[PDB]
Structure 1
Amino acid sequence: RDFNNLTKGLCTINSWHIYGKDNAVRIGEDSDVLVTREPYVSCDPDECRFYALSQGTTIRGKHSNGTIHDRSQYRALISWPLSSPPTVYNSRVECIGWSSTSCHDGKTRMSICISGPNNNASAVIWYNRRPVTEINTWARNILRTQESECVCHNGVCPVVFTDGSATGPAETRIYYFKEGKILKWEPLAGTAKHIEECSCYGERAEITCTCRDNWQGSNRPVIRIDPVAMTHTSQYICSPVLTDNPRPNDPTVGKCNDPYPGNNNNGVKGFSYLDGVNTWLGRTISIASRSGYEMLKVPNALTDDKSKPTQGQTIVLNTDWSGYSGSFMDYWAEGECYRACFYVELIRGRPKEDKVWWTSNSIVSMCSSTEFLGQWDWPDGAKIEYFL
């Protein structure tokens, strides 16, 4: 109908309830399930779907060998029904590429896929399932984007791109699209030193993204965007509760405008909901690998450099593999407020489980509840020995 506007604030998050789980690897042991990674969830006004970057082969197929690799001509952004596994027969291809983002503006959906060699990549913006705009690499070093949904307000959908070094200063740009066309783009501003894979959500006409500083920060950079004025700023989450991975152990005081040192040249896509005392951070339990997953309520984490957890919820036990995580919300649900949601990618295979030659994942997603619900852990559930 008309363009969606971010007119509501976030609901109070007292706990998280189970939303969707596909059990892809369990089912894929004996079904035609596509090998994937970098999944996410995104909603249309009438349906919410699972999304991911396919590797162009099934798990049981011989071409699954070598799927640990990130970029190839055989990947594609695919979407499929909520909680179903990504199968060959029920998956819909959005575009061809090894990095992506996608969001509905209220009228129709925009999907962006980046493909190419490392030094000659390009993004093609699709709108209403047709290619509309193309952007060539500007720093000639792996043009990349969010790997989770973008957000729109009155037709304008900002998207964060990064091109250049992953272990040094790079060139990040914020593009403001409307109906697939570029209205404007800015270079990154603020105090963030490195930006990659931003996880965004919107409320009260403002868009907040929690990204990944791959170069030096263990605390996460944040970009706040004003989609009306088409401007932005960046900083780091102040809290000592560090959320990247790998990372040092938590200190007693954090850093607001500088990366917290400890781990270099590595990280993981993550997210957070920054809403005053209604603030929740997600993170792997392990400080060394993508293992376990928990949510921690850290009041004023964004601005308080000494803030520590007041409540928490374990999503995946530390004995189980996790991976990327990002944010999404059903902006078309009924209600007085936006219910915060998130997904966790559960990676199986290489590099950790090297008895198999593939790398894939399943998905688990939760949304917030105003009740204080009991918790359960949500592992992938596949027994790797069954694949030998």
Structure 2
Amino acid sequence: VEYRNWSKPQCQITGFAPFSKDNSIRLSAGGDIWVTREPYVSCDPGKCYQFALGQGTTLDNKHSNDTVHDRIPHRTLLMNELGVPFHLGTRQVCIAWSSSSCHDGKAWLHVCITGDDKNATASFIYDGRLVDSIGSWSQNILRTQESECVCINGTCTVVMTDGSASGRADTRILFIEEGKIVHISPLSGSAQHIEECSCYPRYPGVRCICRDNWKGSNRPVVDINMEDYSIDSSYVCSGLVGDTPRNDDSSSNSNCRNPNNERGTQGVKGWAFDNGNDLWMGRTISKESRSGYETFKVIGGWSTPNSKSQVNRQVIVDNNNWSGDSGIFSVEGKSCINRCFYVELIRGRPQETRVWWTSNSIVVFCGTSGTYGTGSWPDGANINFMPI
């Protein structure tokens, strides 16, 4: 039982291969399955787990009505082995309407936020016990990543933001050792309006690609120095931008430094990672709505502003199907650290009004150095077959 250091090079991938799918909504029409949203994946050194925020109810249940609402006291963090759908034997790890989890090589850390919008509490649970907590600092919806945190040599880091809703984002980067907060660093650099960071180890530090909670369709970047707690930040250079809504590729812009003002309505959590000068990224296929999902490599997408040449595109979910939040997780291999991602497949409200609930399933892909084909792996439920 040694601490993870993630001190291997990043795997040099050619694209992604199918890893997992849970079929939650299809099963929900013939079984008792939790209503969820904001899922993610994180792995201990041996095996992977799927997480999501429950809505305190199963789908075929009158309490499923109005589950489009983001925050209620009954939301809890669910945790199963990856591919075990959220059945009634699922453990609720903590009370949470916003969360992040990660394993440090020895045990699990869970960051769980619940309570009043104006005065939330974040609990820090490590190795099965509550070790620390912090209250809201801006009194305006304290929130965190909705994907895995990252630990190096026993110190885990997680990004949180309070006050972005009111246009006064106060973003802080926490450093946590065995559940205890040992340092808090304010955001520094040129990133603004940070929400929902998707972070990954990039030894010796941690790098996050997030979303801008005002009008940037280009994604913020946060760099975390684990040695001295210093922070820097910017925007992804790629002219093929990662958020939705967004302009078409021809009329999209990013200068690597500032938000581009090219998204007019609420954006979506997503991810990307650098490989030298290039950038691997995912995004919705639609530029208007959370439908479809595609991945590709942008040539110069990390280093060159407004870079727009891509290669190695893959469709994950075709544009006739709903997507949602997406995020990165990292998995240690023999010789390298691999990058994987999940896609939230949102069903029900607001897009599908036959039913009165909102829930999701997931699909999960992992980096590969090998070869692969094509397909599309959507949620797959028939909305007309569902309990309403």
TM-score, normalisation: structure 1: 0.97
In the alignment, the residues of structure 2 paired with residue 40 and residue 215 of structure 1 have an alpha-carbon distance, to the nearest angstrom, of 24
Q: Which residue of 2 aligns with 1:46?
A: 46
Q: Which residue of 1 aligns with 2:21?
A: 21
- Structure with the higher strand share, 1 or 2: 2
Instruction: Please state if 1:301 is matched with 2:301.
Output: yes
In the alignment, the residues of structure 2 paired with residue 227 and residue 299 of structure 1 have an alpha-carbon distance, to the nearest angstrom, of 29
Task: Summarize the Cα distance change of 1:208–1:76 in structure 2 as closer, same or farther, 3 Å threshold.
Answer: same
Question: SS state of the match for residue 316, structure 2?
Answer: strand
Instruction: Please state if 1:215 is matched with 2:214.
Output: yes
Map 1:53-68; keep pairs closer than 5 Å. 53-68=53-68
Which whole-Å deviations, capped at 9, do the CAs of 1:90-120 have from their partners, x for residues lacking one? x112110100000000111100110111111
In the alignment, the residues of structure 2 paired with residue 18 and residue 207 of structure 1 have an alpha-carbon distance, to the nearest angstrom, of 26
- Shift of residue 253 of structure 1? 4.8
In the alignment, the residues of structure 2 paired with residue 226 and residue 108 of structure 1 have an alpha-carbon distance, to the nearest angstrom, of 22
Map 1:1-388; keep pairs closer than 5 Å. 1-89=1-89, 91-166=90-165, 168-250=167-249, 251=251, 253-277=253-277, 279-308=279-308, 309-331=310-332, 333=333, 335-388=334-387
* Letter matched to residue 108 of structure 2: R
* Letter matched to residue 174 of structure 2: Y
After TM superposition, what 4+ stretches of structure 1 lie above 4 angstroms from structure 2?
Answer: none
* Letter matched to residue 299 of structure 1: I
8 Å Cα contact 2:253-2:260 kept in structure 1:
no
- Shift of residue 278 of structure 1? 5.2
8 Å Cα contact 1:49-1:81 kept in structure 2:
yes
8 Å Cα contact 1:167-1:265 kept in structure 2:
no
In the alignment, the residues of structure 2 paired with residue 259 and residue 278 of structure 1 have an alpha-carbon distance, to the nearest angstrom, of 20
- Shift of residue 299 of structure 1? 2.4
Question: SS state of the match for residue 161, structure 1?
Answer: strand
In the alignment, the residues of structure 2 paired with residue 167 and residue 45 of structure 1 have an alpha-carbon distance, to the nearest angstrom, of 40
TM-score, normalisation: structure 2: 0.97
8 Å Cα contact 2:278-2:302 kept in structure 1:
no
* Letter matched to residue 39 of structure 1: P
- Shift of residue 167 of structure 1? 5.5
- Shift of residue 47 of structure 1? 1.9
In the alignment, the residues of structure 1 paired with residue 252 and residue 354 of structure 2 have an alpha-carbon distance, to the nearest angstrom, of 40
- Shift of residue 252 of structure 1? 6.3
Q: Which segment is superposed worse, 358-367 or 198-207?
A: 198-207
In the alignment, the residues of structure 1 paired with residue 374 and residue 13 of structure 2 have an alpha-carbon distance, to the nearest angstrom, of 14
8 Å Cα contact 2:15-2:296 kept in structure 1:
no
5+ long unaligned stretches in structure 2: none
8 Å Cα contact 2:123-2:130 kept in structure 1:
yes
In the alignment, the residues of structure 2 paired with residue 42 and residue 65 of structure 1 have an alpha-carbon distance, to the nearest angstrom, of 29
Q: Which segment is superposed worse, 42-51 or 319-328?
A: 42-51
Q: Which segment is superposed worse, 313-322 or 298-307?
A: 298-307
Which whole-Å deviations, capped at 9, do the CAs of 1:196-248 have from their partners, x for residues lacking one? 00001113222110101011210000001121222220000111101101112
In the alignment, the residues of structure 1 paired with residue 261 and residue 56 of structure 2 have an alpha-carbon distance, to the nearest angstrom, of 38
Which whole-Å deviations, capped at 9, do the CAs of 1:236-292 have from their partners, x for residues lacking one? 011110110111222365221110112235210000011225521100011111000
In the alignment, the residues of structure 1 paired with residue 142 and residue 115 of structure 2 have an alpha-carbon distance, to the nearest angstrom, of 9
In the alignment, the residues of structure 1 paired with residue 78 and residue 253 of structure 2 have an alpha-carbon distance, to the nearest angstrom, of 42
In the alignment, the residues of structure 1 paired with residue 216 and residue 56 of structure 2 have an alpha-carbon distance, to the nearest angstrom, of 34
Q: Which segment is superposed worse, 145-154 or 164-173?
A: 164-173
Task: Summarize the Cα distance change of 1:253–1:97 in structure 2 as closer, same or farther, 3 Å threshold.
Answer: closer
Which whole-Å deviations, capped at 9, do the CAs of 1:66-96 have from their partners, x for residues lacking one? 110000011000101211211112x112110
Task: Report how many residues are paired.
Answer: 385
Question: SS state of the match for residue 46, structure 1?
Answer: coil
Task: Summarize the Cα distance change of 1:42–1:30 in structure 2 as closer, same or farther, 3 Å threshold.
Answer: same
In the alignment, the residues of structure 1 paired with residue 19 and residue 210 of structure 2 have an alpha-carbon distance, to the nearest angstrom, of 23
5+ long unaligned stretches in structure 1: none
In the alignment, the residues of structure 2 paired with residue 374 and residue 110 of structure 1 have an alpha-carbon distance, to the nearest angstrom, of 37
In the alignment, the residues of structure 2 paired with residue 265 and residue 292 of structure 1 have an alpha-carbon distance, to the nearest angstrom, of 18
